[PDB]
Design a binder for these strands. Structure first.
Length: 301
DNA sequence: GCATAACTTCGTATAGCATATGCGAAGCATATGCTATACGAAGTTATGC
């Protein structure tokens, strides 16, 4: 850590701006490179392309998915670039091995994953079960899913919306605004969000976040400044799934239960089942055209 | 005086997206950098008997 961290902080001085997600990632690549570089002693910072070739073969023998290795190589090249040295990716051999292992592991039959779809009928079932609920933290989850499906928002978008961010019409719909665009909400879940607001009492300042922590004994808490962590919002979907079905299987496979994208895929696939014109889908999601939309539509029943 | 529920901070793995190049000479298929989940685990503190 210390030596590598102090080295990387030279780049922090030289290149101070990144997403919190990027500079998290580069450090965790460098940890693994340094560890390997110790366990077979070679010079640690200035890369030798033959050593990169050894490293890429060592990773390929652990059978990591090709999307991982291409990222490790990317981060190494970023580090050389912003430090001010020739890029290891300039090596012909490095390219040759990358192409070879890419073809090999593709021929080995890997597939990209796709999340389980939160189709409309599951929402209707869980609503039919929880509609009678009065325990506060049930109400919260029932409202949350009601928005997170209908409005097609990304999980880290909906986590942000302040009560200031919401507009209301008496006897009608409710409208939501997100960073110059406005999105509109069905006359059902309006009643759920109204119930949540009126029972929890978060409305004392529009600057409060609409979603907030709730404690063991059923009393809510306000906050103007502390948001609910997305790691708990995934803990909503996974909990309600574990309420409708038994526990996850021990095979360790991923996407065995709903996650943040299960709403988007559920909505898109249901709209395709409704026979919508696909450009209307692309307009609703705002998605720049790439075949991921087709892949979500890949099959119906 | 200790046990518990519901949540917050780290870490090592993959998917999304915006932009750019070829190849061929019009259009877009494939390639490249950067940003964001999914999951298991360790750690926090308020309420309770």
């Amino acid at each position: 850590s210390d030596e590598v961290r102090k080295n990387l902080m030279d780049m922090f001085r030289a290149r101070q701006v990144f997403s919190e997600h990027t500079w998290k990632m580069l450090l965790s690549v460098c940890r693994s490179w340094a560890a390997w570089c110790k366990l077979n002693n070679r010079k640690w910072f200035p890369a030798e392309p033959e050593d990169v070739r050894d490293y890429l073969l060592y990773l390929q023998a652990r059978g990591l998915a090709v999307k991982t290795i291409q990222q490790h190589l990317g981060q190494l090249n970023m580090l050389h670039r912003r430090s001010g040295l020739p890029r290891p990716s300039d090596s012909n051999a490095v390219s040759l091995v990358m192409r070879r292992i890419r073809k090999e592991n593709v021929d080995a039959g890997e597939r990209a994953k796709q999340a389980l779809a939160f189709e409309r009928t599951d929402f209707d079932q869980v609503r039919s079960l929880m509609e009678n609920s009065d325990r506060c933290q049930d109400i919260r989850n029932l409202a949350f899913l009601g928005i997170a499906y209908n409005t097609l928002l990304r999980i880290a978008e909906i986590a942000r919306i302040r009560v200031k961010d919401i507009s209301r019409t008496d006897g009608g719909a409710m409208l939501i605004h997100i960073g110059g665009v406005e999105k509109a909400l069905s006359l059902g879940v309006t009643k759920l969000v109204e119930r949540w607001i009126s029972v929890s009492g978060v409305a004392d300042d529009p600057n409060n976040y609409l979603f907030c922590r709730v404690r063991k004994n059923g009393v809510a808490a306000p906050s103007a400044t502390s948001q609910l962590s997305t790691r708990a919002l995934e803990g909503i979907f996974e909990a309600t799934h574990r309420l409708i079905y038994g526990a996850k299987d021990d095979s360790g496979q991923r996407y065995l239960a709903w996650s943040g994208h299960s709403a988007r895929v559920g909505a898109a696939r249901d709209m395709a089942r409704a026979g919508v014109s696909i450009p209307e889908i692309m307009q609703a999601g705002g998605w720049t055209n790439v075949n991921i939309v087709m892949n979500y539509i890949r099959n119906l029943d």
